């Protein structure tokens, strides 16, 4: 019925997508060779949303992996659940962008985007009732951000009526992996604000802090971080894949969380995340999940939301639960800390319940908050962008490829008016 096609860009997008299709495959009970061996046929009734049957129950993911460097593809095919992708979908360049948005948006896109557009089109009309697209990429790197950005623009120009998710990782000064982070991030969101329907902002710092405090894990490799983000993404799409008492589709959450067309950036949190030694000592109730949801040290962004106001929020619950308890918990958290929410919108919380929990858990919850604390992050980026732009440092690598100065100025302008309207509604 409703269909979600997947897009992965860049190194981070590939590794994130790899873990994503790992957990989804484990959720639907399909083996790493591509055959179903699960238990409940409740898994079968909604595998078409993510899979197409090839020959004798060979379900392949409806995904498109795309980057510019083969080492990422090798790391994809190395691990398990790497032999289930259709090798045609590995559309793939050869030269490499190398943390250059101009290379990822004008040079390499000119010979890769018609190819990925061919593949995504064939993948689009292959299914009947498209629900939307799901993108996993970055904003600091070159081949993920720029190529994905131009791809998003082309897609939104072809299919204006379908939905669109974008999971984009943003950088921080504390964890600054590359140098041109603001040069790329500013331009990326400057395109996202007019192209994407909504964006779920991520980062690594919040993940490190979460594994510091809540998980008490020793060495958090990228796999566990991608494992968390993957658990988030399975949670956000649980409503379509399983029956429930109150189902909230993708468009349904978007219309409940987006009151204004340019206010479509969310922060995300996932519960429950507890250390293994302390996993035994806890009860498993809705208040137990609620105390962890509304903890500000549990968001997946470097924007402590109690420095601002929640415009709207949404909770996606999985597991057999009392809807009464669900709602009165939402009413209580909304009545006590009433200054943390916006005033001119009553009932700022959209809730939904699905009956099937993620595997291995009794009762889980995915939180999506559209708060105005994200303007702290954007200002935290724009000041770095202006600090660099005043001195025109590292700018010749961009202007020597086809980009000019006015694109940077309009990125500054859109950055500034966005944070101005965020500050306004605060």
């Amino acid at each position: 019925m409703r269909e979600i096609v997947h897009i992965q860009g860049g190194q981070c997008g590939n590794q994130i997508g790899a873990k994503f299709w790992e957990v989804v495959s484990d959720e639907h009970g399909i083996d790493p060779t591509g055959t179903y061996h699960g238990d409940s046929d409740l898994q079968l009734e909604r595998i078409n949303v993510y899979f197409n049957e090839a020959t004798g129950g060979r379900y392949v993911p409806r995904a498109i992996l795309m980057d510019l460097e083969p080492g990422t593809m090798d790391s994809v095919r190395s691990g398990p659940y790497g032999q289930i992708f259709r090798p045609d979908n590995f559309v793939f360049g050869q030269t490499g962008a190398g943390n250059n948005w101009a290379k990822g948006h004008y040079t390499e896109g000119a010979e890769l985007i018609d190819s990925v557009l061919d593949v995504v089109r064939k993948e689009a009309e292959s299914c009947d009732c498209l629900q939307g697209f799901q993108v996993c990429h970055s904003l600091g790197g070159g081949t993920g951000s720029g190529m994905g950005t131009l791809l998003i623009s082309k897609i939104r120009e072809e299919y204006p009526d379908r939905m669109m998710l974008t999971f984009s990782v943003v950088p921080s000064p504390k964890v600054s992996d590359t140098v041109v982070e603001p040069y790329n991030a500013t331009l990326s969101v400057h395109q996202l604000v007019e192209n994407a329907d909504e964006c779920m902002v991520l980062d690594n710092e919040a993940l490190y802090d979460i594994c510091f405090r809540t998980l008490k894990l020793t060495t958090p490799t990228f796999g566990d971080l991608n494992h968390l983000i993957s658990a988030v993404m399975s949670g956000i799409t649980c409503c379509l894949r399983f029956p429930g008492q109150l189902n909230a589709d993708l468009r349904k959450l978007a219309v409940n969380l987006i009151p204004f067309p340019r206010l479509h950036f969310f922060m995300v949190g996932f519960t429950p995340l507890t250390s293994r030694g302390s996993q035994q000592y806890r009860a498993l109730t809705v208040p137990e999940l609620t105390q962890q949801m509304w903890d500000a040290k549990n968001m997946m962004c470097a924007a402590d939301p109690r420095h601002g106001r929640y415009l709207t929020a949404s909770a996606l619950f999985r597991g057999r639960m009392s809807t009464k308890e669900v709602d009165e918990q939402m009413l209580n958290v909304q009545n006590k800390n009433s200054s943390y929410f916006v005033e001119w919108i009553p009932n700022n919380v959209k809730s939904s319940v699905c009956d099937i929990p993620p595997k291995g858990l009794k009762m889980s919850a995915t939180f999506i908050g559209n708060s105005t604390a994200i303007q702290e992050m954007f200002k935290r980026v724009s000041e770095q962008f202006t600090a660099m732009f005043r001195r025109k440092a590292f700018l010749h690598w961009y202007t020597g490829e086809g980009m000019d100065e006015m694109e940077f100025t309009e990125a500054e302008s859109n950055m500034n008016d966005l944070v101005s309207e965020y500050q306004q509604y605060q």
């Binding site: 019925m1 909604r46 029956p243 409940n256 009151p259 009392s322 009464k324 001119w344 919108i345 009553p346």
Partner: protein, 427 residues
């Protein structure tokens, strides 16, 4: 005599899942469809040893409907009436009224056509919908409009699920609620509000279930519906049809919004506790601690009340109890209406459901009254609606669908005029 029931939205069909479960359990029909004349008003006798119901489930998202298609009642409902779209309206009245309705309402009504040609003595329709959602409100209203232009003169009983004042699960449900009332006003004939917080309180207080789900809510809601049609289905000492609601409860053509209540809501152990007689249940059907709509009827005056009795009830004591009600001064009536009661007595007691939390009782009362406390409810909705519309929030979804500010302002002022009318009749 026949009456068909349509179910719009994800909420309506869950209500249908408990409602038809109770009907088949009442007439002794196993989920496979056959018994091992009273059934004639809900089930048509197809073939030999088979009965199919007179309903249409319809919804745009197929998840809940095809769950019914594959549940235990696969053989009762053959899936030709279970209408299902391809994609949801997503809490968007405009999407559910113009984009998707224009492909689904026609298929619904040319199915309801040959249902109606099958029936012979059709009393009317009765609709189950939730006005907080997108599908129930949008094409629900659209279906009611095309029903009115198709038949018009036939009665339509609307059992709606309004949003609660403070307890709420959606965000834009004020917009969808107001846009539903603008057509629910001049298209429905008899509208019964039912809210969720009131039922949560009933199940918490009387049924002492600390953790209820939607199932228990839908179970006692089905108890209400079955109790108000039991007069048609079974013979009583004094029975009343669907037309009596319109006659004895609708003073004026734009005042049709009835509070509902039920008694006795008693668990298995509390039935061992308490002696159930007509006087105390007639009293209990008047406290706000036992109403289906969260509102204070003391703040208003009751224009006209209707009491359905089921079970071991003689006209003597029910007339004695209504006498005490008429002479009590804690609840005041409206001066204009001098005789504001419509009684109805049926012999068959209400049935139990295995796994249900209610116990079997000698007798039960379904009260349906009309007040001005609803006049308080709509103003309470009107206030929080203008709070959002003052900032033009969430409007871009609707106009992007293709609507405008015109129906916004005209539905807003329509509730304003309804407010002035209720304030004027309360005199």
């Amino acid at each position: 005599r026949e009456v068909i029931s349509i179910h719009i939205g994800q909420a309506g069909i869950q209500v249908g899942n408990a409602c038809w479960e109770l009907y088949c359990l009442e007439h002794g029909i196993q989920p496979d469809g056959q018994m091992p004349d009273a059934f004639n008003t809900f089930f048509s006798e197809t073939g030999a040893g088979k009965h199919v119901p007179r309903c249409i489930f319809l919804d745009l998202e197929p998840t809940v409907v095809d769950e019914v298609r594959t549940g235990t009642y696969r053989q009762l409902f053959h899936p030709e009436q279970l209408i299902s779209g391809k994609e949801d309206a997503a809490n968007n009245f405009a999407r559910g009224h113009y984009t998707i309705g224009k492909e689904i309402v026609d298929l619904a009504l040319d199915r309801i056509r040959k249902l109606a040609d099958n029936c012979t003595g059709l009393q009317g329709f009765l609709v189950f919908n939730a006005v907080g959602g997108g599908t129930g409100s949008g094409l629900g209203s659209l279906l009611l409009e095309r029903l009115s232009v198709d038949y018009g003169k036939k009665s339509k009983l609307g059992f709606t699920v309004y949003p609660s004042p403070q307890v709420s699960t959606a965000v834009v449900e004020p917009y969808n609620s107001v846009l539903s009332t603008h057509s629910l006003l001049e298209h429905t004939d008899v509208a019964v509000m039912l809210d969720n917080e009131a039922i949560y309180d009933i199940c918490r207080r009387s049924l002492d279930i600390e953790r209820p789900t939607y199932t228990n809510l839908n179970r006692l809601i089905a108890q209400v519906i079955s109790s108000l049609t039991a007069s048609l289905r079974f013979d009583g000492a004094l029975n009343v049809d669907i037309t009596e609601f319109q006659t004895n409860l609708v003073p004026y053509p734009r005042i049709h919004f009835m509070l509902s209540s039920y008694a006795p809501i008693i668990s298995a152990e509390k039935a061992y506790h308490e002696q159930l007689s007509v006087a105390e249940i007639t009293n209990a059907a008047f406290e706000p601690a036992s109403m289906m709509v969260k509102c204070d009827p003391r703040h208003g005056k009751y224009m006209a009340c209707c009491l359905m009795y089921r079970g071991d009830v003689v006209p003597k004591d029910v007339n004695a109890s209504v006498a005490t009600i008429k002479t009590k001064r804690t609840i005041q009536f409206v001066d204009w209406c001098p005789t504001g009661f419509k009684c109805g007595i049926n012999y068959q007691p209400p049935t139990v459901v295995p796994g249900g939390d209610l116990a079997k009782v000698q007798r039960a009362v379904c009260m349906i009254s009309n007040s001005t406390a609803i006049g308080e409810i709509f103003s309470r909705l009107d206030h929080k609606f203008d709070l959002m519309y003052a900032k033009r929030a969430f409007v871009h979804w609707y106009v992007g669908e293709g609507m405008e500010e015109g129906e916004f302002s005209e539905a807003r002022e329509d509730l304003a005029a309804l407010e002035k009318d209720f304030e004027e009749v309360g005199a």
